[PDB]
């Protein structure tokens, strides 16, 4: 067919033209995850596929599904990592290094993993603030 | 002389997400979910995936998640499966009209059991998230 090149320009960052499938993909967030719905030209036609993609974008905007989910714990140095799906806690090891530990949400439970991370960070913070190195003992004389 | 044949039998399909390969090369599922198909343009083969989901009503507005789609790489196949998937195991979702009755009886007892018998009591569903 004959089509102007401006057809493939999208007016919103969440609306993308996918040329392999020749479809308009609309991104959104559902159930604390990212999803994309395609609108194919083979289904709707040239102009109608884009029109329906824009209408679905407006629907998701009204539903509030364009907002980025956020995971926070309120404790500095403890944050959720998507790549490993784990709660990461950062502290200082015995060697005086900066080290981290990751507790798996799939295994422990999301909140269980968060709690384990926070408690481990607190324990290591206590040990570090103590100040004693390896194989060290504190004695007070008066 | 496979390359000269034309019948659809000779050309096998390929495993994808949550799918294994059997001894005789059967493609079998590995998780509770819903079937999806994909077309690999690079290899020109069909790929069988299973999107993990708990049992619930299959709605008209959700049928687009199981469309057959074209991909170039298995990495893109996994990406598409993630994008169409409904929810993740660690967060779950609000089930829409999930089943509540026990499953169908074993085949050797009765081949024609009834699905979701209202006369039977509600029993917990604690196997379809695995």
């Amino acid at each position: 067919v004959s089509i102007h090149p401006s057809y493939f320009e999208s007016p919103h960052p969440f609306v993308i033209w996918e040329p392999l499938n020749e479809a308009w993909e609309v991104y959104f967030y559902e159930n604390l995850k990212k999803s994309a719905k395609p609108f194919p030209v083979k289904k709707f036609g040239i102009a109608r596929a884009k029109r329906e993609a824009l209408l679905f974008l407006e629907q998701m905007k009204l539903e509030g599904k364009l907002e980025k989910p956020t995971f926070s714990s309120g404790v500095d140095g403890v944050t959720f990592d998507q790549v490993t799906g784990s709660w990461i806690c950062r502290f200082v090891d015995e060697e005086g290094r900066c080290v981290s530990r990751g507790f798996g949400a799939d295994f422990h439970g999301f909140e269980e993993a968060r709690k384990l991370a926070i408690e481990r960070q607190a324990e290591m913070k206590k040990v570090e603030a103590s100040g004693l190195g390896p194989r060290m003992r504190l004695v007070k004389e008066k | 002389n496979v390359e000269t044949k034309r019948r659809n039998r000779h050309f096998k399909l390929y495993p994808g997400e949550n799918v294994k390969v059997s001894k005789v090369t059967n493609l079998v599922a590995l998780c509770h979910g819903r079937v999806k198909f994909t077309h690999d343009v690079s290899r020109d083969v069909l790929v069988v995936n299973v999107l993990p989901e708990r049992r619930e009503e299959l709605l008209r507005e959700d049928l687009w998640r199981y469309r057959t789609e074209h991909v170039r790489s298995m990495e893109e196949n996994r990406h598409i499966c993630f994008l169409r998937r409904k929810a993740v195991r660690m967060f779950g979702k609000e089930l829409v009209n999930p089943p509540t009755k026990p499953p169908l009886r074993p085949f050797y007892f009765t081949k024609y059991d009834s699905w979701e018998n209202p006369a039977l009591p509600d029993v917990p569903q604690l196997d379809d998230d695995m």
């Binding site: 798996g104 949400a105 799939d106 295994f107 422990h108 439970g109 999301f110 909140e111 269980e112 993993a113 | 195991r89 660690m90 967060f91 779950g92 998230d129």
Partner: peptide, 13 residues
């Protein structure tokens, strides 16, 4: 909100 339980919480402890 409530969260689904992990694999650990399903073993016969």
């Amino acid at each position: 909100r409530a969260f689904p339980r992990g694999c650990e919480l399903k073993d016969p402890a």
